[PDB]
Design a protein around this ligand. Structure first.
Ligand code: GPP
Ligand code: MG
Ligand code: MG
Ligand code: MG
Ligand code: MN
Lengths: 320, 335
């Protein structure tokens, strides 16, 4: 992202906080409104805002050059901040259901994005498609979180649940819809692109990129140079665990049953040793090359009047 | 009414099918979501959902009250019940409560716990899918979506304000003012319980005049304040649900008025014993409420508030049926 794109995007955030904390309204509840400003300030605008900035970039690469006014690019930035409010609610729910934050802050922050949408977009033709997209993405993300939870019982991973079909569904519902589809579909709607066939062609490619993104992340959790990866300790339905179970003989499966999802550092090393024995690094290398080629082909084939350069830019960001 | 109750209850199974059986790649999680809805949504009194139907029936032109429109009002009532179910799932986890409507709290069910947070957000998100299915073609669609999102935001402000009356699980009695109490009740309870059903009835009746919505709101916030004060009173003075407001350190009307009326010695009993787990501390607080004459104070408030609200309803500007607001008063005051 350019300095100009980043600075213009960041310039919106203080307005969003003022909008949501009723600045100029003279509220009857100033204590809790001031607290909510801190919830937003402490949790929403920090670090990389990749999903929010991707919303702006998607809009800039989908819209007609003539319509790329400072006003329309600022609307794209506001949609980007609504994606970041959703991201912040999800990260808050993560901080809560593993560990100042109150349990209802995740609900509150999620609800706040709809107030921002009403303020800035309610008079535009894209309003209803955009709110329905956020509604649908919220519901599907919750389904993905529940499907992930159905892989654990009484603090132990259920290895019979670790199928590639279930893994692919968790990644799609829990992560890819809100991370990859939502920014691009928002850019399309702000560009007055409503055609279901266009959204569908974008979705096919974005779910493929999202699957590689999570598989790469799962690979690096164990095999990256260090955050220090805890997927094995936490019993996560990781791509590595799924493929290990596909590749295991009965003796190797017994090692997974005994040592996967255990707190002891030695058990994490036993699983890493089994992943090495099973050739998961070589399997990832083959998958990275094969998935790159398939996705590149699908982007070359993209039709329905969609630009290729947006999808190539997304693919190159993930694959480097 | 038997007919109203049965017609309303008949809609629930269709809504569960709409939300779980219309994602064919993930049947395990749709089957689980059906159980989340079946446990948390349809077993209560459904006062708020039924009140949405009654509000609509009293706001709509009699000649437009078709079975089809009454069913739409019922679907909106179930969306209110979905919102409430999400809120109580979350509140029960936050308050670590044992039971709700005489069932174990959802978060206490095997392998839920903090996953109740995801179930809360899921149940709330689900009502917008119901709205899209049945209302997307109607002029009331966007006002209704916006009302649900705004009431969710305001209810969260109420829940967070309630939490600013506690520090590390101990009540902050300096926070227990009638001003803060009134604000908690308005935002945490009255908006979703009283404003939302009536405003939904108004929108389905194509009544969009913000001033009609404002006048309804003034009366409904007054009725909602009495409703919560009565509930607080009965938590301590009701005849056996066994009330635990004292043990929980709740910012109750009884605690607020006790602090107004207390001499320094009585204040110290509140400081020492309010929000403690020991049964004898609850007894000490109840005994202080008796010493301070809170029963007589409630009896006077019940009489005066009834008369003041009846006066305000008589003054409601034409367009709104006084009968609707009197019917709500009669439900709450039982007269
Ligand atoms: C944003 C959220 C989660 C709002 C909760 C709304 C609500 C009605 C809580 C119950 O209040 P309470 O805990 O004072 O009373 P009860 O005794 O009914 O739990
Ligand atoms: Mg990871
Ligand atoms: Mg509670
Ligand atoms: Mg009560
Ligand atoms: Mn509570």
């Amino acid at each position: 992202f350019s300095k100009e794109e980043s600075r213009e995007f960041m310039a919106i955030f203080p307005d969003i906080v003022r909008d949501l904390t009723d600045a100029g309204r003279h509220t009857d509840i100033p204590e809790v409104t001031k607290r909510f400003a801190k919830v937003l300030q402490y949790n929403v605008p920090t670090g990389k805002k990749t999903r929010g900035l991707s919303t702006v970039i998607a809009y800039k690469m989908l819209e007609k050059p003539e319509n790329l006014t400072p006003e329309n690019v600022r609307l794209a930035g506001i949609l980007g901040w609504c994606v970041e409010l959703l991201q912040a609610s999800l990260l808050i729910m993560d901080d809560l259901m593993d560990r100042f934050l109150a349990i209802n802050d995740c609900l509150h922050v999620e609800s706040s994005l709809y107030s921002v949408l009403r303020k800035y977009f309610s008079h535009l033709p894209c309003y209803v498609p955009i709110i329905e997209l956020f509604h649908d993405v919220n519901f599907k993300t919750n389904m993905g979180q529940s499907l992930d939870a159905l892989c654990m019982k009484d603090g132990r991973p259920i290895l019979s649940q670790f199928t590639m079909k279930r893994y692919s569904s968790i990644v799609k519902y829990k992560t890819s819809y809100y991370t990859f589809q939502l920014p691009v579909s928002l850019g399309m709607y702000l560009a007055d692109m409503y055609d279901p066939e266009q959204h569908r062609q974008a979705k096919t490619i974005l779910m493929e990129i999202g699957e590689f993104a999570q598989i790469q992340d799962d690979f690096l959790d164990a095999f990256g140079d260090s955050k220090v990866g805890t997927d094995i300790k936490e019993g996560k339905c990781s791509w590595l665990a799924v493929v290990a179970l596909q590749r295991s003989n009965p003796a190797q499966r017994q090692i997974m049953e005994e040592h996967y999802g255990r707190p002891e550092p030695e058990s994490t090393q036993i699983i890493k040793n089994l992943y090495i024995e099973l050739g998961l690094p070589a399997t990832f290398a083959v998958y990275e090359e094969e998935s790159f080629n398939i996705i590149r082909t699908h982007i070359h084939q993209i039709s329905k009047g969609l630009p290729h350069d947006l999808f190539f830019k997304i693919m190159k960001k993930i694959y480097k």
